[PDB]
Design a protein around this motif. Structure first.
Motif, PDB file in Angstrom:
ATOM      1  N   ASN B 133       0.807  -1.205   0.000  1.00  0.00           N
ATOM      2  CA  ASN B 133       0.000   0.000   0.000  1.00  0.00           C
ATOM      3  C   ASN B 133       0.847   1.265   0.000  1.00  0.00           C
ATOM      4  OD1 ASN B 133      -1.752  -2.085   0.432  1.00  0.00           O
ATOM      5  ND2 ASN B 133      -2.187  -1.538   2.556  1.00  0.00           N
ATOM      6  N   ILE B 134       2.164   1.137  -0.016  1.00  0.00           N
ATOM      7  CA  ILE B 134       3.080   2.276   0.005  1.00  0.00           C
ATOM      8  C   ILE B 134       3.707   2.417  -1.377  1.00  0.00           C
ATOM      9  CG2 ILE B 134       5.061   3.334   1.118  1.00  0.00           C
ATOM     10  CD1 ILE B 134       4.497   1.923   3.608  1.00  0.00           C
ATOM     11  N   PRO B 135       3.642   3.594  -2.003  1.00  0.00           N
ATOM     12  CA  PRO B 135       4.148   3.744  -3.373  1.00  0.00           C
ATOM     13  C   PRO B 135       5.661   3.609  -3.476  1.00  0.00           C
ATOM     14  CG  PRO B 135       2.567   5.457  -2.848  1.00  0.00           C
ATOM     15  CD  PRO B 135       2.907   4.791  -1.562  1.00  0.00           C
ATOM     16  N   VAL B 136       6.107   3.210  -4.668  1.00  0.00           N
ATOM     17  CA  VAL B 136       7.528   3.034  -4.936  1.00  0.00           C
ATOM     18  C   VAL B 136       8.193   4.397  -5.065  1.00  0.00           C
ATOM     19  CG1 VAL B 136       9.161   2.248  -6.685  1.00  0.00           C
ATOM     20  CG2 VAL B 136       7.310   0.765  -5.961  1.00  0.00           C
ATOM     21  N   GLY B 137       9.279   4.600  -4.322  1.00  0.00           N
ATOM     22  CA  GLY B 137      10.026   5.839  -4.351  1.00  0.00           C
ATOM     23  C   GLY B 137       9.962   6.631  -3.069  1.00  0.00           C
ATOM     24  N   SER B 138       9.007   6.336  -2.194  1.00  0.00           N
ATOM     25  CA  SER B 138       8.871   7.060  -0.944  1.00  0.00           C
ATOM     26  C   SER B 138       9.955   6.646   0.041  1.00  0.00           C
ATOM     27  CB  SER B 138       7.494   6.803  -0.336  1.00  0.00           C
ATOM     28  OG  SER B 138       7.338   5.432  -0.040  1.00  0.00           O
ATOM     29  N   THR B 139      10.382   7.596   0.867  1.00  0.00           N
ATOM     30  CA  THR B 139      11.333   7.303   1.930  1.00  0.00           C
ATOM     31  C   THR B 139      10.580   6.853   3.169  1.00  0.00           C
ATOM     32  OG1 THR B 139      11.375   9.553   2.811  1.00  0.00           O
ATOM     33  CG2 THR B 139      12.855   9.047   0.986  1.00  0.00           C
ATOM     34  N   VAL B 140      10.984   5.712   3.722  1.00  0.00           N
ATOM     35  CA  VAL B 140      10.330   5.123   4.877  1.00  0.00           C
ATOM     36  C   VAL B 140      11.360   4.940   5.982  1.00  0.00           C
ATOM     37  CG1 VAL B 140       8.457   3.975   3.669  1.00  0.00           C
ATOM     38  CG2 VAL B 140      10.667   2.884   3.879  1.00  0.00           C
ATOM     39  N   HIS B 141      10.864   4.578   7.158  1.00  0.00           N
ATOM     40  CA  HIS B 141      11.706   4.266   8.300  1.00  0.00           C
ATOM     41  C   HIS B 141      10.961   3.267   9.168  1.00  0.00           C
ATOM     42  CE1 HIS B 141       9.165   7.277  10.365  1.00  0.00           C
ATOM     43  NE2 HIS B 141       9.541   6.680  11.480  1.00  0.00           N
ATOM     44  N   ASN B 142      11.697   2.673  10.117  1.00  0.00           N
ATOM     45  CA  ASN B 142      11.183   1.679  11.070  1.00  0.00           C
ATOM     46  C   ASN B 142      10.554   0.486  10.346  1.00  0.00           C
ATOM     47  OD1 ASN B 142      11.003   1.114  13.942  1.00  0.00           O
ATOM     48  ND2 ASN B 142       8.784   1.261  13.694  1.00  0.00           N
ATOM     49  N   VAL B 143      11.268  -0.029   9.353  1.00  0.00           N
ATOM     50  CA  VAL B 143      10.744  -1.081   8.490  1.00  0.00           C
ATOM     51  C   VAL B 143      11.215  -2.452   8.962  1.00  0.00           C
ATOM     52  CG1 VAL B 143      12.523  -0.805   6.710  1.00  0.00           C
ATOM     53  CG2 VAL B 143      10.472  -1.873   6.128  1.00  0.00           C
ATOM     54  N   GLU B 144      10.274  -3.390   9.004  1.00  0.00           N
ATOM     55  CA  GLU B 144      10.505  -4.762   9.409  1.00  0.00           C
ATOM     56  C   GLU B 144      11.340  -5.513   8.382  1.00  0.00           C
ATOM     57  OE1 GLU B 144       6.535  -6.239   9.763  1.00  0.00           O
ATOM     58  OE2 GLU B 144       6.154  -4.990  11.528  1.00  0.00           O
ATOM     59  N   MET B 145      11.915  -6.629   8.823  1.00  0.00           N
ATOM     60  CA  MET B 145      12.509  -7.593   7.909  1.00  0.00           C
ATOM     61  C   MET B 145      11.592  -8.780   7.662  1.00  0.00           C
ATOM     62  SD  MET B 145      16.535  -7.914   8.661  1.00  0.00           S
ATOM     63  CE  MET B 145      17.678  -6.549   8.633  1.00  0.00           C
ATOM     64  N   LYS B 146      10.702  -9.074   8.604  1.00  0.00           N
ATOM     65  CA  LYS B 146       9.705 -10.122   8.486  1.00  0.00           C
ATOM     66  C   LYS B 146       8.340  -9.535   8.813  1.00  0.00           C
ATOM     67  CE  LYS B 146      12.738 -13.975   9.661  1.00  0.00           C
ATOM     68  NZ  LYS B 146      12.888 -15.217  10.462  1.00  0.00           N
ATOM     69  N   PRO B 147       7.266 -10.016   8.178  1.00  0.00           N
ATOM     70  CA  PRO B 147       5.935  -9.437   8.431  1.00  0.00           C
ATOM     71  C   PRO B 147       5.427  -9.784   9.824  1.00  0.00           C
ATOM     72  CG  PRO B 147       5.806 -11.238   6.856  1.00  0.00           C
ATOM     73  CD  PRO B 147       7.253 -10.937   7.032  1.00  0.00           C
ATOM     74  N   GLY B 148       5.289  -8.758  10.662  1.00  0.00           N
ATOM     75  CA  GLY B 148       4.814  -8.912  12.019  1.00  0.00           C
ATOM     76  C   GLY B 148       5.889  -8.861  13.080  1.00  0.00           C
ATOM     77  N   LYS B 149       7.163  -8.879  12.689  1.00  0.00           N
ATOM     78  CA  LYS B 149       8.251  -8.929  13.659  1.00  0.00           C
ATOM     79  C   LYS B 149       8.462  -7.599  14.364  1.00  0.00           C
ATOM     80  CE  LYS B 149      12.998 -10.422  14.002  1.00  0.00           C
ATOM     81  NZ  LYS B 149      14.025 -11.299  13.404  1.00  0.00           N
ATOM     82  N   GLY B 150       8.426  -6.503  13.627  1.00  0.00           N
ATOM     83  CA  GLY B 150       8.758  -5.206  14.170  1.00  0.00           C
ATOM     84  C   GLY B 150       9.880  -4.546  13.393  1.00  0.00           C
ATOM     85  N   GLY B 151       9.950  -3.224  13.529  1.00  0.00           N
ATOM     86  CA  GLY B 151      10.920  -2.452  12.770  1.00  0.00           C
ATOM     87  C   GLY B 151      12.337  -2.734  13.225  1.00  0.00           C
ATOM     88  N   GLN B 152      13.197  -3.088  12.273  1.00  0.00           N
ATOM     89  CA  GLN B 152      14.598  -3.349  12.573  1.00  0.00           C
ATOM     90  C   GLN B 152      15.504  -2.428  11.777  1.00  0.00           C
ATOM     91  OE1 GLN B 152      13.462  -7.458  12.121  1.00  0.00           O
ATOM     92  NE2 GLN B 152      15.293  -8.029  13.279  1.00  0.00           N
ATOM     93  N   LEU B 153      14.992  -1.866  10.697  1.00  0.00           N
ATOM     94  CA  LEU B 153      15.800  -1.058   9.800  1.00  0.00           C
ATOM     95  C   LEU B 153      15.412   0.407   9.946  1.00  0.00           C
ATOM     96  CD1 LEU B 153      15.554  -3.173   6.498  1.00  0.00           C
ATOM     97  CD2 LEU B 153      17.502  -2.967   7.944  1.00  0.00           C
TER      98      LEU B 153
END
Lengths: 46, 271
Positions: B133-153
């Motif tokens: 649901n997030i468009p390609v090109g946007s800058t993000v933060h607090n992004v998970e490595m696995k779905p449901g785990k929690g933000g690691q990056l």
RNA sequence: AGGACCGAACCGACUAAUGUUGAAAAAUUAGCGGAUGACUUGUGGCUGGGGGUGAAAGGCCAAUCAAACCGGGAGAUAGCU
RNA sequence: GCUCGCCGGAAGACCAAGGGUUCCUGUCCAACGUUAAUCGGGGCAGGGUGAGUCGACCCCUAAGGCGAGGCCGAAAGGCGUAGUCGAUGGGAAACAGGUUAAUAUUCCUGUACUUGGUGUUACUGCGAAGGGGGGACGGAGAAGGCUAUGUUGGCCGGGCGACGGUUGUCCCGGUUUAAGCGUGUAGGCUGGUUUUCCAGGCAAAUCCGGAAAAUCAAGGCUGAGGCGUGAUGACGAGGCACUACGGUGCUGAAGCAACAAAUGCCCUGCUUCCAGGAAAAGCCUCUAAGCAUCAGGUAACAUCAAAUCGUACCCCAAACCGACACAGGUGGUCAGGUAGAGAAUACCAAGGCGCUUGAGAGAACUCGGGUGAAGGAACUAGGCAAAAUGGUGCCGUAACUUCGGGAGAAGGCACGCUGAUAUGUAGGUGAGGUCCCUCGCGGAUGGAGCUGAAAUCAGUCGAAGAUACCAGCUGGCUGCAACUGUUUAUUAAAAACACAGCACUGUGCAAACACGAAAGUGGACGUAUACGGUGUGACGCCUGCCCGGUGCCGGAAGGUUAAU
RNA sequence: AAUUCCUUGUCGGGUAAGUUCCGACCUGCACGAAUGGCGUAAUGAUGGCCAGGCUGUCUCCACCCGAGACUCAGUGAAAUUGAACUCGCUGUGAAGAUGCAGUGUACCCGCGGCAAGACGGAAAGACCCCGUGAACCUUUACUAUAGCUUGACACUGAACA
RNA sequence: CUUUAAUGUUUGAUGUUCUAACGUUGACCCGUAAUCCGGGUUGCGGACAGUGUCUGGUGGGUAGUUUGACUGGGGCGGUC
RNA sequence: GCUUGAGUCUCGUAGAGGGGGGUAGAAUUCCAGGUGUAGCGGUGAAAUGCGUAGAGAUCUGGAGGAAUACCGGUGGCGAAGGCGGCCCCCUGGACGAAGACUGACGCUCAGGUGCGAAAGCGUGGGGAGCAAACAGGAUUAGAUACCCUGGUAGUCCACGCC
């Protein structure tokens, strides 16, 4: 001049006491050696 | 902003403070506090395993939402607070049903902003959504490595992740190191970049500031003896062999990455 | 405000003299450095010997340290005295 | 016993740790005391340590330890979940006098307070390794209000001074009194009350959180200290009868006020800062499973219980750690007078000591000091050591600088006492009065008393007025290291180490790396503005050329190449 | 120059006189750019030099006050030590003599002092050498080995080019 | 016999897909008013990773050692 | 007092005037892949360089930065420096028909203040081309140059200097 022996009966009993000897098998070997030698006091700390 | 101190003493000569008047002056939210005891340089075997860690200031851990949930419930942002456990600031948010939580505060977040976490959430800084649901090109933060785990990056202050491509089930990300890696598209990510981007602009000024941080002095192997370090010895200053770690592995160059189950996910190595 | 200044408690130990079978197996006397801080201290805990710990001197680990102490191999071996 | 000296932020008093009878009394002087000893921390005998309120135990947890099962490991064993221990921290409650040769918030007297059990009465929804609140927290700085405490005056008692004068503005002493109960104040914090609803609190909840209405800024919580009571009590200077001169008993007057006061209390407050400042229980509240004149919860009264262990004595030391009755070491608490910024220092209080060999004499020489003619570093490796300077206020102050510094730069002037300004001023403090308010720990005007610098004129003394102790030497040119700091505890404190900065390099998280035979753990409840390793070492200007050698990174075309 | 052997290089200043100091030159034995180069306010119980003050540091010591040393009474060690009836000189001598030879000198024994000797005491020299000695450290010495890494086989299978 | 767009039928190198061993320091449930550990459901990876045996390289990170003798002291030089 | 100098209002007009943000299209470079073979590149000639591990050439997909071909002009705007793709937001100035208003409010201005190309400096980013320094190959008697092959600061962005 602060000398090496600074007494404390709590640290004495925690470090060299009877239950500290009985916790480890090696302290039980210490107690076995002292009973075999025939010491009047097993743990002189206690 | 940054504050260059007046040189009224050495140790105040060379210190830059970053100060935020927007940060909360007072106690943190006590239901979201835990005890944090110092354990660096202390294994469960009791040995120092990471060097140069020692006494600093006592700190309390704040339970920060990284696996953000409560989908569909908007949350108003109260005053931003200080977090000793991380370089970023945090935000105490209040959901509509009466639940307060701690959020990694993004760059534009102010007290009174609305945030949301669902799949129907409008794309806006501070909102989290899975990366389909997030468009390609946007800058993000607090992004998970696995779905449901929690933000690691991208959890440090001022950091962001660029969404570069989409496989169809995976999302390619440009990380802050320059690495491109494949992360599953159901992993969530908070929009915008992390605030406190002036954190790298502080200069500590003196050794006492590093000691308040908790960093013990670093001894050079050249200053050590041959028994202590592979460097060390000599009747002058020069040792004269290839620079290594204290345990013999070469430290200038010599990439040390032995993972083989994540090589399918790292696309381009960082430069 | 300040690893700010002067200076007691407190922490330390730069110089000199005395002591060197000492009052003391490192101290006394006269000065000396820090004294809101990388400070100092009480109590308890943790790290154990090719190991620990070290703002690093091979320093320190019970007046013992270029590998503690105790017991054992052990009456090691000694072309040396 | 009378003098003399010494300590007096201790060389006094009380503990903790540690010790374990060294405590008190009687007796002895062999050994022990660096001498004698009639004395003793010595020998031998007795005695002595009294708790619901002090501490331990106990409830609760930190670091950490152990750890059913569990995971791992040739064995031994390692780690660790539930859990259970673990103070150096958090939960109930007692104060003042008197007493013993030796105990003392414990015994006695007076006045209290807390937590449980049981029973009676009255009302009633009670009920949890569960939820919530609270416990519950940093550094620094600045008030204000006090108090412990001290000084002075009043009052009371005594005095009338070995030598001139003296009580008739004199001299000495005392002038104490607590917990508890009541009042709820200098302050500090916070808006209360009622009603309705819920995507939250591992379920429920009337509790917490959130949202929406009416009402008024008046309700709540915390809080030293004061005052009243405790208390016509106790204590109290002295006096009076018996003395074996240890002493016992009776009686016992004033017992107020003002001022100056903490580093203690309000205050875990307030302000401010970044380095962002334990945990759990006791306590309060809510319901879950369960029960319904039941069991329970509240309030009143009565009664019972609070066990056990420690309690002597030393504790800047002759009882601890140092082989010693050892010039050393040892955590906390109390904190008087005068001068003084002061917990410095000097002299003294209370109190405790004269340090367990003395007596002579007055050589060299040694140690620790005092003073020195003339010279003034000629000494020496070197101003080593000694001498010198030293305080407050005011004037004045260079090169250079990163603008902060340098800088107390350097260099000077005045300091005592008396009197006047001013029979004690500026200031501080605040009783009798006077006027208001829901008339009390209230507000406003005063301005009696008490306390009180600093300055200026004038006079006066000595050689000298920061007169003692105390208390800085100053300036110039350079090397090194930016600095504060750390270091060979016991011959080196440095230019060494570290340092903030700078750069290179590794690291995409089950990260690198480290400890581990492995589980696991640190890194990190962090996430490339992060973490590690290396080298350099603030700052300013900069960091040139060389990839042949050795490392490292990238590539696989060819050669060589293992087990198979 | 914390770096320069020659070397106290040479020139200038400071001093009556300066192997150190400061400023230069460059003839850098053998500086040199994060093994960091050059400079740098402040700082330093840091190294060198100069000056004012100050003085017993000195010319060159003098006096005084205390604690010892001295005497008396009490208690009472220590290192060391083959035995001693334990002089000087010159020579000799395992090669520096209290002890040997020749000779000179010297009644016996204390006390206070000084240390020239007793190759004085202490510590089976630490410097040097030796031992087919030890330890620790280094490396591009030799041989192994933990770790890291390469591949084969096993755990480990099914389809498609 | 060297080869054939269905058949008698093997071996070895990468490449793609699958799940079904294996991994999971993803989410949920139970043991259980437990951050451990099992079991279950599901997601992701997946015959990879990782481990065992064998093996080539690297390996002062450790470990055991060697590093001669003569010599007008030893070392340097020289000699055997 | 007046409007005739200066200024204000009404309605319009042109413009790369400035600040912020977003987007588009050629092209260069780099990465991955397909086809294909022995040269490419460069120069007055060569050579260094790239390519026998597959270059150059052609095609596909992706990444990133910078400047905006044509329009484009002896055009336009701004006080000067300067400003060129398109779109939006905020905003400065200029000019014009006509009417109204204030009524000398004007000109210049030493000191003062602000703006100010390019190069350069500080901090943090970015870096595709180009390119001081640097290296190699040529040229030359020599060549620390002109030329070629690479190539760092810089050129680009934000905030400060100069």
């Amino acid at each position: 001049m602060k000398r090496t022996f600074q007494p404390s009966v709590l640290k004495r009993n925690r470090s060299h006491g009877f239950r500290a000897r009985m916790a480890t098998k090696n302290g039980r070997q210490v107690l076995a050696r002292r009973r075999a030698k025939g010491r009047a006091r097993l743990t002189v700390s206690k | 902003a940054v504050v260059k101190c007046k040189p009224t003493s050495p140790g105040r000569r060379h210190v830059v403070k970053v100060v935020n008047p927007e940060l909360h002056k007072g106690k943190p939210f006590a239901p979201l506090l835990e005890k944090n005891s110092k354990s660096g340089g202390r294994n469960n075997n009791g040995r120092i395993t990471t060097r140069h860690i020692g006494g600093g200031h006592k700190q309390a851990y704040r339970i920060v939402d990284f696996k953000r949930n409560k989908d569909g419930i908007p949350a108003v942002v109260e005053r931003l607070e200080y977090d000793p456990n991380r370089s970023a600031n945090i935000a105490l948010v209040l959901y509509k049903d009466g639940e307060r939580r701690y959020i990694l505060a993004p760059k534009g977040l102010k007290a009174g902003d609305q945030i949301q976490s669902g799949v129907d959430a409008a794309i806006k800084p501070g909102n989290t959504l899975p990366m389909r649901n997030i468009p390609v090109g946007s800058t993000v933060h607090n992004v998970e490595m696995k779905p449901g785990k929690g933000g690691q990056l991208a959890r440090s202050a001022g950091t962001y992740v660029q969404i570069v491509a989409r496989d169809g089930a995976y999302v390619t990300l440009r990380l802050r190191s320059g690495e491109m890696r494949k992360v599953e598209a159901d992993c969530r990510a908070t929009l915008g970049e992390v605030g406190n981007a002036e954190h790298m602009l502080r200069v500590l000024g003196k050794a006492g500031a590093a000691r308040w941080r908790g960093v013990r002095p670093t001894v050079r192997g050249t200053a050590m003896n041959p028994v202590d370090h592979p460097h060390g010895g000599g009747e002058g200053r020069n040792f004269g062999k290839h620079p290594v770690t204290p345990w013999g592995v070469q430290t200038k160059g010599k990439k040390t990455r032995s993972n083989k189950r994540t090589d399918k996910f790292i696309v381009r190595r960082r430069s």
